[PDB]
Amino acid sequence: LQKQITKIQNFRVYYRDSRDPVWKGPAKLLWKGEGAVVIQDNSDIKVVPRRKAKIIRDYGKQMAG
Amino acid sequence: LQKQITKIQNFRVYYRDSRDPVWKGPAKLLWKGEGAVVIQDNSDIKVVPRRKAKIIRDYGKQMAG
Amino acid sequence: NFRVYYRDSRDPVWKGPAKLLWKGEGAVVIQDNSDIKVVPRRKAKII
Amino acid sequence: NFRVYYRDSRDPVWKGPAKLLWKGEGAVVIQDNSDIKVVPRRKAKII
Amino acid sequence: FLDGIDKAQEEHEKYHSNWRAMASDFNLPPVVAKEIVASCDKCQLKGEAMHGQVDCSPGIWQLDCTHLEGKVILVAVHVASGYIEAEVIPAETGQETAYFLLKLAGRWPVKTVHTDNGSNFTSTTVKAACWWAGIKQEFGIPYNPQSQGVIESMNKELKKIIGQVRDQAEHLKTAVQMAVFIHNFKRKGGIGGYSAGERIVDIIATDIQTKELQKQITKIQNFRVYYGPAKLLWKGEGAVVIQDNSDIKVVPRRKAKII
Amino acid sequence: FLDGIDKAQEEHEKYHSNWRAMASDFNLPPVVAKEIVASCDKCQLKGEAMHGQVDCSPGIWQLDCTHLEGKVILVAVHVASGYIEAEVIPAETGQETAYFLLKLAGRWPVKTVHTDNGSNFTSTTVKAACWWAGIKQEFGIPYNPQSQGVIESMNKELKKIIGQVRDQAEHLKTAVQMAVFIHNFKRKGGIGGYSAGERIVDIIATDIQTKELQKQITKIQNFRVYYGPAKLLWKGEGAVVIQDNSDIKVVPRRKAKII
Amino acid sequence: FLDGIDKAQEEHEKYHSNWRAMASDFNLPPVVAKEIVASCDKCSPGIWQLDCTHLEGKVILVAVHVASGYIEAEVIPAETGQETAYFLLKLAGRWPVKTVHTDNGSNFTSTTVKAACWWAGIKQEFGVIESMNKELKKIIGQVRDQAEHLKTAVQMAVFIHNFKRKGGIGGYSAGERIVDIIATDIQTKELQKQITKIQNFRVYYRWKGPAKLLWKGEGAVVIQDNSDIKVVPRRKAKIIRD
Amino acid sequence: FLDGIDKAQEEHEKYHSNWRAMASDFNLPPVVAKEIVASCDKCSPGIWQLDCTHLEGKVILVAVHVASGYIEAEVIPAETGQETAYFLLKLAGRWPVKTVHTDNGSNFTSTTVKAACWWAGIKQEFGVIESMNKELKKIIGQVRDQAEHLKTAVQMAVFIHNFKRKGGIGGYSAGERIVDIIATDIQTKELQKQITKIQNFRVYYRWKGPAKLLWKGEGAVVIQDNSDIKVVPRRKAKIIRD
DNA sequence: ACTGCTAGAGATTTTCCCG
DNA sequence: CGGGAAAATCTCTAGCA
DNA sequence: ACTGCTAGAGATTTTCCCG
DNA sequence: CGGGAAAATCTCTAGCA
Ligand SMILES: Nc1c(C(=O)NCc2ccc(F)cc2F)c(=O)n(O)c2ncc(CCCCCO)cc12
Ligand SMILES: Nc1c(C(=O)NCc2ccc(F)cc2F)c(=O)n(O)c2ncc(CCCCCO)cc12
Ligand SMILES: [Mg+2]
Ligand SMILES: [Mg+2]
Ligand SMILES: [Mg+2]
Ligand SMILES: [Mg+2]
Ligand SMILES: [Zn+2]
Ligand SMILES: [Zn+2]
Ligand SMILES: [Zn+2]
Ligand SMILES: [Zn+2]
């Protein structure tokens, strides 16, 4: 199980706040549901709506991660 | 003479830098020539072109100055 | 409760005031004389 | 020495390259085929 | 002071002066001046200074018809990625839009379509086509082009790319397909350093993989939480995310217990 | 690597891909990719991302003709203050513009006039009128409205104010004069908390007073400086401002001596 | 600050200078100097004058700022009420006019002029206009040939009389005189607003009885009590409203 | 990191797993796992297939992604070269096609198709298309009545065959299969770019002789020497180009 | 060799004012 | 010294053909 | 009940790389 | 540790009818 927890924690999330029109940095996807996404940015837990998060597995992961 | 030095140092100058499109705060007009204006903002001496400085004697000086 | 002035559709003239039915992040929905309209918040002043 | 591409007058098509005669803060003056033009720096790429 | 308010109203009904002028000419405090201005119907002429944020879910596209060289190009864009499809249609009518939308639904997994209130997209043909394909339609506010801020932007980009390859193709449709090729597979940038097509492939693959992993985890990790019994989502070394009756909250390890 | 550059050029001549795509598909460093892109004539399509700064001297005005309700309103604005004059003219011809400009030169001390390249302002009549009044003409770049960024802005404001008092006047010229009144004397704000008219009066009075004081001081304070013999401007408790052959510099007390 | 107040009031008791002089001499806040002036018992810029003048068969409106001599002329097609109201509204928008002193003519008492005066907040009344009118006609006669029509000639004469005829005491042109007078008026208005704002306050210092507030600096408070101006530290006096 | 390399290479010598498995098992950088795989001697997604099909008198182009089964059909007015080149350019813009394996027809060998293939960088060749074509015609025959024309019927059949017919091993539809295969291809391409970038380097460690660079982390450097993978601290090995 | 700006609306930071 | 209130400052958009 | 955005160009900040 | 080079990030404008 912990393997899949760590797997789903490998993806990256780019999000935006409610009045912040610039795309925030690549967070760490902790949980992804039907309408919201729980992420951790700079060791701060946030809950961003599904309609404000691009979830990519950056395939420039062949050097780090 | 020092009276007139202090007098010309009472006026206020609002200026702008070369790539800074917001009006800087009220400086202290130290010298005003034909093409340039020497001011002192936050105890830093600057030389701004004449075409970038509004020189007003703020008549809200009836409380301070 | 509230008042909302809006600029609806290619009409530079503003209009109002109108009741504020629901204010959402990005646009509001208001009711002006039994007319339910949706207006982006860039075109609506809320008091 | 330099090269300048510009968008002159209500013509969305760009043109160039053209020699850079004098670059001033706000706009440049350039020489394209013996034509001396003035162009705002928002409409001119300088290489 | 009260005579101040009276004279200030009697003057604003004539001049319509802003709150600073009434606060300076009648010695009113800024609160009363703003209250005087905000009660006049004619002096309310500028809305908010903000911008919204369009829907950028991994299953919503934006369509729009642009005009180039006297022809009509129907352009759709995957919002979350920027992968665009385009096709020169003979007329900006409902049938062509419905056909192109059914094509796009066959190719990529579209779940929502966001268009302006153009007759092409507002028709019963695109509606029947959306009802058949399980597509949810989402029209923008009338006469608010910024609501389609993605696709219109792509329009610009698309046109620009045509302006670079227009002389490499005899007709126009060939040039439009070449511009789609260039914008999807030969122009990197964006968020992940990807091109458009690589980014959309990554978006969709990650959506599928994350859905599968989260489904499995939720199937296994079953812990009731107390902090009312909500559902546990993620607990790591200093925080706990709970889901309390359709309201996701985040609490510290304190003020929370797990069963 | 060199084969990389060759293939990258052979591909960019077809696709016209940005520097990131060529740096990613052919393992080029960003410098060589940018050098490849910057050498293509078709891939140079977006200029700088900046904005200039219009002339805001205390002796330069900006004129422009706007259209409202089918009539022509000639509007001038003092750039350094925002005090606007406006007049409904019967036709957007040279004679009316020259007449209004001679009026404005009679009223306020204008020394420069900055207009667009409208025929009204480009004519020989406004030129003779400017030559008679000692006014220096300064046309903006053709088809660059932002170069008159002040007056056009005022246009908006002026029109808005008319939209508030248009029903308080029968004709239009009366409403335009009322809007000028409201914008000059009943709408405070700006830099010094002034209205427009108070701010222009302050600007001009301060210009005159500062010119007089600086003239007197320069007449009295005569100190040659050494740091080549320049002229001394101001020396206070840690700095010295010198004027070396039409080049104003600022030095510390060190590296400077006064005679 | 404390060294300046007694010096300034002693200087006024000596030879009764004006408050601007005291402010510019001892670096006093203008409110304190105004109060010192008002401490001795022994111790206008918006008065425009309009008129109509006939010349070459056309009528010109002439508006003279009485206190400065700055002039404003305009050729109007007919000596009616509508054109007079229009010109007066223009003049009210341009310069801070507060009172118009006309000549009880047939047009300056019309209902349209009265409306335009009630709108701009201009009071109406009913001999400097004659000399200035004769001077303006002299300048028109001088500079007529340099223009074709009459409107341009009148505007050129106005330009000459406003910015090219220096006289008086200091040799300042009419334009510099009017901008200086209006700057002085703005200074007076701002000082009056400050006084009116600070007037309805009250202070209790060191305790002591009531006192009227004069100036509230950073940590110092200048008050007046029994026609005597004092200064106190802030936390030693509490202020209230009234 | 040091604990994982020996474990992974011993596991490969045990039963020769793949490099993705080693990377996901011991948290190794994919380059190191690729090298470990290449350390044993004993140890495609862009191949599209086009064809033309006649139905109801109209011709449809069918393009099948061989490795996945994802289909793309389009009713074209005439089986000519121009329309084939247009459809192929569309397909090249949409999906990352790198090779097209046609049937040596009269249109797929035209000069216009050859030009469109040389532009998009598509190689040309000259049996899964038959079964997929029969399946697509079956679905068209099924869903024909739900549309009026034939274009809409063909597009609906494509939709059904791409996102509503799940089979195979894991029950994934054709669309999910093709997006997964293309994601795997992108991963392989990025890993190949990384290897090609790191390949022309050289390192000198602890001294010692030449060695090929494998990974350059923060303060650790993973190198290879004499078919043996080692790790060193950064300041103990200097890198150069070649 | 010449040039975006102005005002209001709301969010955010800094000052004031006693307790 | 320190919490609210209030003033001041920062951000930003519409419209200026 | 819904919503500006994208890419490039140049300035500015942060990281890298030996010495 | 610390100066340049280089990569990364911030700012911002045109155009999308
Ligand atoms: N007006 C349209 C625009 C447009 O205005 N572009 C200017 C613009 C400005 C700013 C910005 F950010 C983007 C942006 F495009 C557009 O782009 N599209 O695709 C339209 N498609 C269809 C209709 C018909 C509407 C029918 C009447 C409504 O019921 C209009 C439009
Ligand atoms: N086009 C003109 C604009 C204008 O474009 N406004 C849009 C606009 C956009 C942005 C912005 F910041 C301001 C802004 F106004 C204008 O305002 N004025 O006064 C003009 N006056 C005269 C001519 C005739 C030119 C003759 C041909 C050139 O030789 C054109 C214009
Ligand atoms: Mg549209
Ligand atoms: Mg559009
Ligand atoms: Mg114009
Ligand atoms: Mg204009
Ligand atoms: Zn109002
Ligand atoms: Zn190019
Ligand atoms: Zn006295
Ligand atoms: Zn092996």
Side-chain angles (χ1 to χ4, degrees):
Chain A
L1 175 79
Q2 297 287 312
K3 315 279 286 301
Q4 292 182 357
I5 281 283
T6 305
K7 275 186 55 53
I8 201 172
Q9 288 201 19
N10 273 326
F11 300 99
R12 299 185 174 186
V13 166
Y14 293 76
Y15 64 107
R16 283 185 296 178
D17 303 88
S18 276
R19 280 189 71 113
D20 180 294
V22 58
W23 281 97
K24 289 315 181 184
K28 183 205 299 286
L29 160 65
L30 303 195
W31 185 85
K32 169 188 161 173
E34 272 195 29
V37 171
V38 192
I39 76 187
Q40 163 185 125
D41 197 4
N42 303 327
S43 64
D44 300 68
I45 314 296
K46 303 185 184 190
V47 171
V48 296
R50 183 64 166 114
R51 63 180 205 281
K52 290 170 173 306
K54 308 183 172 190
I55 322 179
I56 65 192
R57 172 60 167 289
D58 197 318
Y59 295 131
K61 81 167 156 76
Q62 315 294 313
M63 72 154 91
Chain B
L1 175 79
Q2 297 287 312
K3 315 279 286 301
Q4 292 182 357
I5 281 283
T6 305
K7 275 186 55 53
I8 201 172
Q9 288 201 19
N10 273 326
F11 300 99
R12 299 185 174 186
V13 166
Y14 293 76
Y15 64 107
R16 283 185 296 178
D17 303 88
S18 276
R19 280 189 71 113
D20 180 294
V22 58
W23 281 97
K24 289 315 181 184
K28 183 205 299 286
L29 160 65
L30 303 195
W31 185 85
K32 169 188 161 173
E34 272 195 29
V37 171
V38 192
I39 76 187
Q40 163 185 125
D41 197 4
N42 303 327
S43 64
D44 300 68
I45 314 296
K46 303 185 184 190
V47 171
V48 296
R50 183 64 166 114
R51 63 180 205 281
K52 290 170 173 306
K54 308 183 172 190
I55 322 179
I56 65 192
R57 172 60 167 289
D58 197 318
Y59 295 131
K61 81 167 156 76
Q62 315 294 313
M63 72 154 91
Chain C
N1 206 338
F2 280 62
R3 292 186 295 134
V4 164
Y5 303 97
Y6 61 106
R7 165 183 101 234
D8 50 348
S9 81
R10 291 299 185 190
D11 218 15
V13 53
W14 287 66
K15 39 188 79 176
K19 299 180 176 53
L20 167 58
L21 291 176
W22 167 88
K23 163 186 155 190
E25 178 253 359
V28 303
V29 53
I30 61 186
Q31 171 172 3
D32 181 341
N33 293 336
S34 67
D35 262 348
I36 287 187
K37 303 174 187 166
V38 193
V39 158
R41 278 173 74 180
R42 292 181 295 103
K43 316 166 160 208
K45 190 165 188 293
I46 303 171
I47 313 176
Chain D
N1 206 338
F2 280 62
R3 292 186 295 134
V4 164
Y5 303 97
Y6 61 106
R7 165 183 101 234
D8 50 348
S9 81
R10 291 299 185 190
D11 218 15
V13 53
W14 287 66
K15 39 188 79 176
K19 299 180 176 53
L20 167 58
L21 291 176
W22 167 88
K23 163 186 155 190
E25 178 253 359
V28 303
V29 53
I30 61 186
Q31 171 172 3
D32 181 341
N33 293 336
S34 67
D35 262 348
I36 287 187
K37 303 174 187 166
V38 193
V39 158
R41 278 173 74 180
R42 292 181 295 103
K43 316 166 160 208
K45 190 165 188 293
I46 303 171
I47 313 176
Chain E
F1 193 101
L2 279 72
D3 50 38
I5 298 183
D6 213 349
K7 295 171 79 76
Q9 272 180 352
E10 293 292 328
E11 160 161 341
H12 167 77
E13 293 303 325
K14 278 194 319 213
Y15 302 151
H16 272 291
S17 50
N18 55 316
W19 71 265
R20 183 72 66 96
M22 291 177 328
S24 178
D25 288 354
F26 294 105
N27 188 267
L28 303 180
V31 177
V32 191
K34 290 168 182 167
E35 203 173 21
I36 289 179
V37 163
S39 178
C40 195
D41 297 337
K42 300 192 193 64
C43 287
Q44 313 287 303
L45 295 174
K46 176 191 162 46
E48 205 153 339
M50 81 179 299
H51 268 292
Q53 266 145 26
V54 287
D55 215 4
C56 78
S57 199
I60 167 167
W61 297 58
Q62 296 209 10
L63 281 74
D64 187 11
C65 313
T66 173
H67 295 226
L68 180 52
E69 284 191 28
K71 296 197 177 300
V72 176
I73 320 175
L74 180 45
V75 187
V77 55
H78 188 226
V79 185
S81 88
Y83 167 96
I84 69 172
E85 295 208 0
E87 181 149 341
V88 185
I89 59 190
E92 207 182 341
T93 173
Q95 291 182 356
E96 305 301 314
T97 306
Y99 178 65
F100 171 79
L101 184 48
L102 196 49
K103 230 169 180 164
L104 184 59
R107 307 288 179 274
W108 292 91
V110 59
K111 273 189 284 289
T112 318
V113 160
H114 189 317
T115 65
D116 53 34
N117 288 263
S119 64
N120 4 335
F121 313 112
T122 306
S123 62
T124 60
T125 308
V126 190
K127 189 182 191 308
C130 302
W131 172 91
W132 188 96
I135 289 173
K136 174 178 193 304
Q137 274 207 272
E138 278 191 2
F139 306 109
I141 287 184
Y143 295 114
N144 186 25
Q146 295 85 0
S147 196
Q148 290 78 21
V150 173
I151 180 62
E152 303 286 4
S153 160
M154 286 320 179
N155 272 340
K156 186 254 284 180
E157 261 309 299
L158 178 63
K159 275 185 155 191
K160 184 185 294 166
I161 302 181
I162 293 179
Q164 293 166 5
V165 306
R166 186 52 195 80
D167 60 63
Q168 297 182 30
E170 191 64 354
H171 282 303
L172 174 64
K173 37 182 181 173
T174 301
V176 178
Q177 307 311 322
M178 294 197 307
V180 172
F181 184 95
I182 294 169
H183 175 258
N184 287 4
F185 289 143
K186 297 305 173 181
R187 296 268 187 110
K188 307 216 171 192
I191 52 174
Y194 290 134
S195 49
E198 300 186 347
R199 194 181 316 130
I200 187 174
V201 162
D202 187 7
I203 279 279
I204 294 184
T206 290
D207 184 32
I208 288 172
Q209 292 181 21
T210 43
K211 177 186 308 308
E212 184 96 339
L213 295 195
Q214 187 48 56
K215 159 183 309 170
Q216 202 282 337
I217 290 186
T218 288
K219 185 150 80 176
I220 287 315
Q221 194 181 12
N222 57 98
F223 278 155
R224 293 188 292 119
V225 70
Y226 290 120
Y227 75 115
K231 186 203 172 33
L232 181 54
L233 286 196
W234 173 92
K235 54 172 192 68
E237 321 197 60
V240 160
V241 176
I242 61 185
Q243 178 173 12
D244 184 29
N245 313 128
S246 285
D247 195 348
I248 288 185
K249 272 196 308 304
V250 48
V251 305
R253 282 314 302 255
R254 309 160 69 186
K255 196 185 177 292
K257 43 170 159 290
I258 307 90
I259 305 312
Chain F
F1 193 101
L2 279 72
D3 50 38
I5 298 183
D6 213 349
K7 295 171 79 76
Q9 272 180 352
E10 293 292 328
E11 160 161 341
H12 167 77
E13 293 303 325
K14 278 194 319 213
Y15 302 151
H16 272 291
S17 50
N18 55 316
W19 71 265
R20 183 72 66 96
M22 291 177 328
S24 178
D25 288 354
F26 294 105
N27 188 267
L28 303 180
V31 177
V32 191
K34 290 168 182 167
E35 203 173 21
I36 289 179
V37 163
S39 178
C40 195
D41 297 337
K42 300 192 193 64
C43 287
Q44 313 287 303
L45 295 174
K46 176 191 162 46
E48 205 153 339
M50 81 179 299
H51 268 292
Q53 266 145 26
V54 287
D55 215 4
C56 78
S57 199
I60 167 167
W61 297 58
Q62 296 209 10
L63 281 74
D64 187 11
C65 313
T66 173
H67 295 226
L68 180 52
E69 284 191 28
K71 296 197 177 300
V72 176
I73 320 175
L74 180 45
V75 187
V77 55
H78 188 226
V79 185
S81 88
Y83 167 96
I84 69 172
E85 295 208 0
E87 181 149 341
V88 185
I89 59 190
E92 207 182 341
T93 173
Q95 291 182 356
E96 305 301 314
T97 306
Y99 178 65
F100 171 79
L101 184 48
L102 196 49
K103 230 169 180 164
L104 184 59
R107 307 288 179 274
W108 292 91
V110 59
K111 273 189 284 289
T112 318
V113 160
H114 189 317
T115 65
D116 53 34
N117 288 263
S119 64
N120 4 335
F121 313 112
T122 306
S123 62
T124 60
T125 308
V126 190
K127 189 182 191 308
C130 302
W131 172 91
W132 188 96
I135 289 173
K136 174 178 193 304
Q137 274 207 272
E138 278 191 2
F139 306 109
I141 287 184
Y143 295 114
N144 186 25
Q146 295 85 0
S147 196
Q148 290 78 21
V150 173
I151 180 62
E152 303 286 4
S153 160
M154 286 320 179
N155 272 340
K156 186 254 284 180
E157 261 309 299
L158 178 63
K159 275 185 155 191
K160 184 185 294 166
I161 302 181
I162 293 179
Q164 293 166 5
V165 306
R166 186 52 195 80
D167 60 63
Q168 297 182 30
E170 191 64 354
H171 282 303
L172 174 64
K173 37 182 181 173
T174 301
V176 178
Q177 307 311 322
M178 294 197 307
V180 172
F181 184 95
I182 294 169
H183 175 258
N184 287 4
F185 289 143
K186 297 305 173 181
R187 296 268 187 110
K188 307 216 171 192
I191 52 174
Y194 290 134
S195 49
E198 300 186 347
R199 194 181 316 130
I200 187 174
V201 162
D202 187 7
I203 279 279
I204 294 184
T206 290
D207 184 32
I208 288 172
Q209 292 181 21
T210 43
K211 177 186 308 308
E212 184 96 339
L213 295 195
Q214 187 48 56
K215 159 183 309 170
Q216 202 282 337
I217 290 186
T218 288
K219 185 150 80 176
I220 287 315
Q221 194 181 12
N222 57 98
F223 278 155
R224 293 188 292 119
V225 70
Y226 290 120
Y227 75 115
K231 186 203 172 33
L232 181 54
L233 286 196
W234 173 92
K235 54 172 192 68
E237 321 197 60
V240 160
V241 176
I242 61 185
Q243 178 173 12
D244 184 29
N245 313 128
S246 285
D247 195 348
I248 288 185
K249 272 196 308 304
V250 48
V251 305
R253 282 314 302 255
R254 309 160 69 186
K255 196 185 177 292
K257 43 170 159 290
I258 307 90
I259 305 312
Chain G
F1 290 71
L2 74 171
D3 50 27
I5 305 141
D6 43 355
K7 264 173 202 83
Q9 55 188 173
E10 272 290 7
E11 178 197 288
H12 177 85
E13 291 310 334
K14 274 170 52 213
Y15 39 89
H16 300 291
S17 88
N18 262 357
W19 71 261
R20 265 191 196 83
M22 309 187 205
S24 303
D25 281 28
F26 310 91
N27 273 326
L28 293 198
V31 195
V32 177
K34 185 79 178 189
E35 182 66 31
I36 293 171
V37 162
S39 178
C40 187
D41 49 288
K42 292 189 292 185
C43 297
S44 162
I47 305 296
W48 291 71
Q49 183 143 2
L50 275 79
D51 191 74
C52 274
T53 302
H54 298 251
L55 164 61
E56 289 188 13
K58 300 172 187 297
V59 299
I60 63 186
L61 278 163
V62 170
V64 171
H65 187 202
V66 161
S68 42
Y70 177 99
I71 204 174
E72 279 202 0
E74 180 158 322
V75 169
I76 57 167
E79 193 182 11
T80 78
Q82 187 195 20
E83 313 282 28
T84 296
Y86 178 59
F87 167 63
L88 186 50
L89 197 50
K90 263 203 268 209
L91 174 59
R94 266 53 154 178
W95 284 98
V97 58
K98 278 310 196 303
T99 316
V100 158
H101 195 306
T102 173
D103 73 336
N104 206 332
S106 43
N107 68 75
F108 299 99
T109 175
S110 178
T111 61
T112 317
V113 176
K114 189 160 141 295
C117 292
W118 173 89
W119 193 90
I122 295 180
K123 296 152 56 180
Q124 289 197 263
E125 312 276 38
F126 294 97
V128 70
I129 185 54
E130 202 87 340
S131 158
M132 213 53 57
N133 201 219
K134 276 180 180 174
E135 180 156 320
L136 182 69
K137 279 176 79 49
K138 187 172 192 280
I139 301 190
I140 286 179
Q142 264 184 345
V143 75
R144 181 58 163 82
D145 273 31
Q146 292 191 19
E148 201 205 329
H149 279 148
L150 184 58
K151 296 187 288 184
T152 304
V154 176
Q155 295 308 317
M156 283 151 67
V158 169
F159 178 94
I160 289 175
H161 174 31
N162 270 328
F163 291 93
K164 284 307 158 186
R165 294 297 173 86
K166 299 165 181 277
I169 317 303
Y172 300 89
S173 56
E176 312 191 5
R177 262 202 301 253
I178 184 159
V179 305
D180 170 50
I181 282 178
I182 293 294
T184 290
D185 176 34
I186 292 177
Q187 279 200 349
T188 298
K189 269 165 194 162
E190 297 285 353
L191 175 63
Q192 186 60 250
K193 282 170 200 165
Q194 196 82 40
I195 283 175
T196 299
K197 172 180 175 181
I198 300 195
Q199 183 207 28
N200 44 17
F201 272 69
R202 265 175 58 190
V203 294
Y204 280 116
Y205 63 117
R206 285 203 294 110
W207 275 34
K208 298 300 287 184
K212 296 91 202 171
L213 173 54
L214 272 190
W215 192 64
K216 179 166 59 182
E218 297 89 0
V221 165
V222 177
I223 73 172
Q224 172 198 34
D225 188 2
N226 317 121
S227 184
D228 182 289
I229 293 90
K230 309 179 188 173
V231 303
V232 290
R234 185 169 192 77
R235 283 172 298 277
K236 193 67 175 176
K238 56 187 298 271
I239 73 171
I240 64 185
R241 284 217 77 207
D242 183 279
Chain H
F1 290 71
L2 74 171
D3 50 27
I5 305 141
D6 43 355
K7 264 173 202 83
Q9 55 188 173
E10 272 290 7
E11 178 197 288
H12 177 85
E13 291 310 334
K14 274 170 52 213
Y15 39 89
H16 300 291
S17 88
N18 262 357
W19 71 261
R20 265 191 196 83
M22 309 187 205
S24 303
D25 281 28
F26 310 91
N27 273 326
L28 293 198
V31 195
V32 177
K34 185 79 178 189
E35 182 66 31
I36 293 171
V37 162
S39 178
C40 187
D41 49 288
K42 292 189 292 185
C43 297
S44 162
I47 305 296
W48 291 71
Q49 183 143 2
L50 275 79
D51 191 74
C52 274
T53 302
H54 298 251
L55 164 61
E56 289 188 13
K58 300 172 187 297
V59 299
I60 63 186
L61 278 163
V62 170
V64 171
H65 187 202
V66 161
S68 42
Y70 177 99
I71 204 174
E72 279 202 0
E74 180 158 322
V75 169
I76 57 167
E79 193 182 11
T80 78
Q82 187 195 20
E83 313 282 28
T84 296
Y86 178 59
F87 167 63
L88 186 50
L89 197 50
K90 263 203 268 209
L91 174 59
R94 266 53 154 178
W95 284 98
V97 58
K98 278 310 196 303
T99 316
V100 158
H101 195 306
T102 173
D103 73 336
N104 206 332
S106 43
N107 68 75
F108 299 99
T109 175
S110 178
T111 61
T112 317
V113 176
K114 189 160 141 295
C117 292
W118 173 89
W119 193 90
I122 295 180
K123 296 152 56 180
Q124 289 197 263
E125 312 276 38
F126 294 97
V128 70
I129 185 54
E130 202 87 340
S131 158
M132 213 53 57
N133 201 219
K134 276 180 180 174
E135 180 156 320
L136 182 69
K137 279 176 79 49
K138 187 172 192 280
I139 301 190
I140 286 179
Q142 264 184 345
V143 75
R144 181 58 163 82
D145 273 31
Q146 292 191 19
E148 201 205 329
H149 279 148
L150 184 58
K151 296 187 288 184
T152 304
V154 176
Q155 295 308 317
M156 283 151 67
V158 169
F159 178 94
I160 289 175
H161 174 31
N162 270 328
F163 291 93
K164 284 307 158 186
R165 294 297 173 86
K166 299 165 181 277
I169 317 303
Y172 300 89
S173 56
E176 312 191 5
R177 262 202 301 253
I178 184 159
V179 305
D180 170 50
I181 282 178
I182 293 294
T184 290
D185 176 34
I186 292 177
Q187 279 200 349
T188 298
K189 269 165 194 162
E190 297 285 353
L191 175 63
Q192 186 60 250
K193 282 170 200 165
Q194 196 82 40
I195 283 175
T196 299
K197 172 180 175 181
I198 300 195
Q199 183 207 28
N200 44 17
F201 272 69
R202 265 175 58 190
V203 294
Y204 280 116
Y205 63 117
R206 285 203 294 110
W207 275 34
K208 298 300 287 184
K212 296 91 202 171
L213 173 54
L214 272 190
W215 192 64
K216 179 166 59 182
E218 297 89 0
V221 165
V222 177
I223 73 172
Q224 172 198 34
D225 188 2
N226 317 121
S227 184
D228 182 289
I229 293 90
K230 309 179 188 173
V231 303
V232 290
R234 185 169 192 77
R235 283 172 298 277
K236 193 67 175 176
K238 56 187 298 271
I239 73 171
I240 64 185
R241 284 217 77 207
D242 183 279

